[PDB]
């Protein structure tokens, strides 16, 4: 089989900045190299094909060259949009095969989160369970912390986060962490806490409730 | 237009067998070669096989011609892959995508996706709770949301305001808990308007549950 090697596994840069990812084939492939960018959760999408042809609705910031062994996909600005895994694949013998990806991120500038909290609903307490919520909305960079406090008591084990792909139109962030307690550990405490440190505050912040 | 349209996400047990679809539209279906590509944790993208629907001759990659039996069905316009012997390394998003017309050697279209979830776990749909606005903090931004919890397998879909609500809008990826269910929170960031009504519309394929919940302060 012809394997293909994309480097590097994985980039930063900053809007409007070029970006160039390559690919090679372990043998000559001719010019049968196509390219596909892939968002989080959606179908690959063709970009360029043929080495250096443009796909339909594909802006002229993305191109590609190459020849034989080895080839080179180039954004010449980077933007917002472009944030996604891109995958080289070779069209020229079965079985077809596809480079292992690039994933292109975003550097801008630190962004400090909003910070919200949320307790578990009447709803959910009525099931046995107690589920307490705190977003930290639109950061930059993704390295954040968060603790959580149960009547001015660190919390550990009982907390997950989930984090955002980077956000397409303004780069930034946005994570979950939630806190699952027994309905019978939540009905014993009254104070609930949440604390946020991140490189955009000056200072640790605290958004709390008193069940 | 173009359209590859996928059939649903499933769970299926360890040692069963699953057909997954792919309906073609907008275009002559006998011209153009249907690929089956599959998309595994940390394996990457991989090519399966082909199907050239006019003649139904098949084409596989040596790594799944066990695995895999692709067909066509050239008077409902739809190609299928059924996977045999499942085991939990098959567990992946399953993608169909046609192959560019010749000179275009390239998978120019693709469907949507098909996640199968190999395990003996039931499917299992989510609880959805409303995740209020605190009564605090009315500079004008406010946030509330909904809790997806408790189902089985991926994935769930969040919309607000049937698609109408779409700024502010923050659809976590679904994380895993130590029970084996999957939950997510979707949240969205309002100027403390309420007076707006909010609805977060969620949908679960694989177990065909749909949830609207209202998020009321």
């Known amino acids: 089989d012809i394997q293909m090697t994309q480097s590097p596994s994985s980039l930063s840069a900053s809007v409007g900045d070029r970006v160039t990812i390559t690919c090679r084939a372990s043998?000559?492939?001719?010019?049968?190299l196509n390219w596909y960018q892939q968002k989080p959760g959606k179908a690959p999408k063709l970009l360029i094909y043929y080495t250096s042809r443009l796909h339909s609705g594909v802006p002229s910031r993305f191109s590609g060259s190459g020849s034989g062994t080895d080839f080179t996909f180039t954004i010449s600005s980077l933007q917002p949009e472009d944030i996604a895994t891109y995958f080289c694949?070779?069209?020229?013998?079965?079985?077809?095969?596809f480079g292992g990806g690039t994933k292109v991120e975003i550097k801008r500038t630190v962004a400090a989160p909003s910070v919200f909290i949320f307790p578990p609903s009447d709803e959910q307490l009525k099931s046995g369970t107690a589920s307490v919520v705190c977003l930290l909305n639109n950061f930059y960079p993704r390295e954040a912390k968060v603790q959580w406090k149960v009547d001015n008591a660190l919390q550990s084990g009982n907390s997950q986060e989930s984090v955002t792909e980077q956000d397409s139109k303004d780069s930034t962030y946005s994570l979950s962490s939630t806190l699952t307690l027994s309905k019978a550990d939540y009905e014993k405490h009254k104070v609930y806490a949440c604390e946020v440190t991140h490189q955009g505050l000056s200072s640790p912040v605290t958004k709390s409730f008193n069940r | 237009q173009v359209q590859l349209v996928q059939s649903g996400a499933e769970v299926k047990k360890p040692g069963s067998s699953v057909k997954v679809s792919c309906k073609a539209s907008?275009?002559?279906?006998?011209?153009?070669?249907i690929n089956w590509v599959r998309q595994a944790p940390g394996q990457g993208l991989e090519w399966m096989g082909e199907?050239?629907?006019?003649?139904?001759?098949?084409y596989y990659n040596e790594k799944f011609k066990a695995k895999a039996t692709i067909t066509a069905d050239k008077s409902t316009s739809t190609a299928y892959m059924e996977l045999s012997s499942l085991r939990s390394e098959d567990t992946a998003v399953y993608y169909c995508?046609?192959?560019?017309?010749?000179?275009?050697?390239?998978?120019?279209?693709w469907g949507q996706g098909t996640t199968v979830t190999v395990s003996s776990a039931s499917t299992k749909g989510p609880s959805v709770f409303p995740l209020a606005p605190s009564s605090k903090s009315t500079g004008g931004t406010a946030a509330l949301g909904c809790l997806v919890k408790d189902y089985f397998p991926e994935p769930v879909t969040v919309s607000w305001n049937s698609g109408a609500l779409t700024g502010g809008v923050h659809t976590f990826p679904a994380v895993l808990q130590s029970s084996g269910l999957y939950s997510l929170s979707s949240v969205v960031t309002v100027p403390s308007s309420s007076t707006q009504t909010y609805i977060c519309n969620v949908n679960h394929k694989p177990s065909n549950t749909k949830v609207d919940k209202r998020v009321e302060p």
């Open positions: 995508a046609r192959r560019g017309r010749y000179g275009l050697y390239a998978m120019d279209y």
């Open positions: 043998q000559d492939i001719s010019n049968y």
């Open positions: 694949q070779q069209g020229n013998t079965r079985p077809w095969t």
């Open positions: 199907i050239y629907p006019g003649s139904g001759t098949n």
């Open positions: 907008g275009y002559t279906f006998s011209d153009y070669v």
